[PDB]
């Protein structure tokens, strides 16, 4: 039915809101006009200020054990985490699999990882 | 006529014979003397004698009850027989002193006296009960290193290190509600029984007994406890038979009834319809023999158990009865089949119908624990008379022709030739 086209990142409501209006008869199209879908989502995000697909190496500042873990976020029930010490490069990279129902303990660093699983499946 | 109803927990099974007098209510568990390791063994017999002790039996006798128990190789039973107008007394006694708290039964005076009497009667059984102990050694060497190998009464070496912790652990691990069946024989109707089990709340636990890791596998073996002090020579050999809920069960019992049981001193058992009694009656090769067919939950035995005062001709008795066993596969007749059919019907009728309502309670509890509902005496008779000679020949070729045997002996058994001759006289070269 009625559909507007998500002027910035706040008004997206699925893949039917990323269309946008077409170009006119004479002007060259800008990327704000015609781009649709995931590319339009990334463009609208980068024009708002944020960038989606949050890529960042995880916080290995503190160690963190079972009184207060290292909290990681995932949209699924598991997230593969490669621990590399209490500094950034202390011991060699050991891969752990923290899931929704079990913490992940490093066995060489000693740090633990626990999720706040966002989910919404 | 043998009605079974599953309640919230327990399974109730009953049969109402209105002409019998003493109605008998008890609970039959499905964890006998083959659901434990060989180190806490005899805890089932110790539980039976704790339930049958002086304290519990005086409490039951002041109210008008009479306790009973029976430990076997997969089921164990606790039966409180009573007068027919008094079975709610039986039910709430069995609730108040076995199913709920047992702290009156399990303190270290009654347990110490019961353990001492059990030790004395187990060593008296080991010394002075010779055919049952060689049937027990036959079970201990047939299914060895595998949980069906255990002694029912328990051994002496694994009974002097048992305390109340073992009995409490066994009552937590095997006295369950998905493992128990309550039974009623005698003249109680079905619905007053379950009405009284559902009025007062009776439930032991909730969980499930631990499943075993090793199933019962036959291992062809041999053992001999030759004590030449003894005047006789009790040997018993047996092959792997068909277990319970197997299709070849009644043909195994019929093939046992083909050769029957014998007693050399009664003049009415010397005239039977066995072809073996024309071979073993001119030199008097034995005193008695009985062909059993035991069927436990996972496997079972099939063989004869004898006793011989003529200890020089033991191998001739073995050889003659093994040639008679090979006659099952090669040339068994039909008149032997019909004689064994009628005699097996007579024996199962004498077993299932009798005056005592506690044996019927034990049999009903066992065959409702393993099967789910009791098949009647009519359907068993129909399955018996539906057996042709070719079914017996097929079963005998399956389980008796050149199969591995297990031998258990005692007494003066040097005349028993050793194993490979007895093993390879289970198969003849066609005469």
């Amino acid at each position: 039915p009625v559909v507007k086209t998500a002027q910035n990142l706040a008004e997206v409501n699925g893949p039917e809101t990323l269309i946008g209006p077409g170009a006119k008869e004479g002007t060259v199209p800008t990327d704000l006009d015609q781009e649709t879908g995931l590319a339009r989502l990334e463009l609208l995000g980068k024009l708002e200020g944020i960038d989606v697909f949050d890529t960042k190496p995880l916080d290995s500042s503190r160690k963190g054990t079972m009184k207060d873990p290292i909290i990681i976020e995932s949209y699924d029930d598991y997230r593969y985490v490669g621990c590399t010490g209490s500094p950034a490069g202390s011991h060699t990279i050991m891969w752990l699999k923290p899931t929704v129902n079990e913490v992940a303990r490093c066995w060489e660093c000693g740090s633990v990882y626990k999720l706040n699983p966002v989910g919404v499946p | 006529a043998e009605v079974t109803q599953l309640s919230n927990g327990i399974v109730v099974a009953t049969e109402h014979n209105p002409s019998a007098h003493t109605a008998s209510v008890g609970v039959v568990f499905g964890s006998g003397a083959a659901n434990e390791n060989p180190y806490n063994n005899g805890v089932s017999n110790l539980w039976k004698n704790i339930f049958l002790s002086k304290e519990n039996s005086a409490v039951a006798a002041k109210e008008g009850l009479a306790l009973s128990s029976n430990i076997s190789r997969d089921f164990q039973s606790y039966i409180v027989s009573s007068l027919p107008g008094s079975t709610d007394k039986s039910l709430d006694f069995l609730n108040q002193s076995f199913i709920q708290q047992k702290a009156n039964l399990l303190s270290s005076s009654n347990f110490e006296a019961t353990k001492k009497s059990v030790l004395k009667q187990v060593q008296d059984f080991e010394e002075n009960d010779h055919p049952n102990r060689v049937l027990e050694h036959l079970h201990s060497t047939a299914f060895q290193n595998t949980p069906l190998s255990l002694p029912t009464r328990g051994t002496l070496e694994s009974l002097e290190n048992l305390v109340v912790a073992d009995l409490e652990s066994f009552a937590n691990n095997h006295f369950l509600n998905s493992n128990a069946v309550v039974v009623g024989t005698g003249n109680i109707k079905h619905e007053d029984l379950v009405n009284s089990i559902e009025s007062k709340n009776l439930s032991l636990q909730t969980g499930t007994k631990p499943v075993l890791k090793k199933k019962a596998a036959f291992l062809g073996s041999e053992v001999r406890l030759r004590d030449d002090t003894l005047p006789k020579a009790w040997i018993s050999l047996a092959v792997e038979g068909e277990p319970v809920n197997s299709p070849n069960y009644f043909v195994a019992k019929l093939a046992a009834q083909i050769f029957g049981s014998y007693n050399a001193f009664e003049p009415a058992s010397r005239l039977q319809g066995i072809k073996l009694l024309d071979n073993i009656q001119e030199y008097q090769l034995c005193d008695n023999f009985n062909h059993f067919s035991l069927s436990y939950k996972d496997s079972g035995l099939w063989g004869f158990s004898t006793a011989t005062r003529n200890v020089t001709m033991i191998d001739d008795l073995i050889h003659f009865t093994l040639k008679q066993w090979n006659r099952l596969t090669i040339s068994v007749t039909d008149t032997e089949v019909e004689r064994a059919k009628s005699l097996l019907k007579l024996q199962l009728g004498q077993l299932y119908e009798s005056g005592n309502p506690v044996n019927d309670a034990n049999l009903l509890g066992a065959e409702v624990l393993i099967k789910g509902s009791k098949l009647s005496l009519g359907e068993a008779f129909k399955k018996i008379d539906a057996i042709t000679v070719k079914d017996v020949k097929a079963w005998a070729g399956k389980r008796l022709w050149d199969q591995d045997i297990a031998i258990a002996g005692t007494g003066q058994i040097e005349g028993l030739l050793d194993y490979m001759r007895i093993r390879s006289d289970m198969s003849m070269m066609r005469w």
């Binding site: - | 180190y39 806490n40 290190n161 048992l162 631990p210 075993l212």
Partner: protein
């Protein structure tokens, strides 16, 4: 003084018994030994120290040899 010691028959011959024990009994004597270790160590009997060492460090399960 709260927890009870394991009796002799529940715990005899345990390195020769750990493989064929049911998986409902193994958790029970594992719980019982890991609460028996919370006492002073000298009152732990010499029958169950071998049991604890075979349960936690024996050549079963994960420590099974490749040959």
């Amino acid at each position: 003084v709260q927890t009870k010691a394991l009796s002799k028959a529940t715990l005899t011959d345990l390195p020769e018994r750990w493989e064929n024990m049911p998986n409902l009994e193994q958790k029970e004597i594992a719980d019982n030994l890991t609460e028996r270790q919370k006492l002073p160590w000298k009152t732990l009997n010499n029958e169950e120290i071998k049991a604890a060492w075979y349960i936690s460090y024996g050549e079963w399960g994960p420590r099974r040899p490749v040959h």
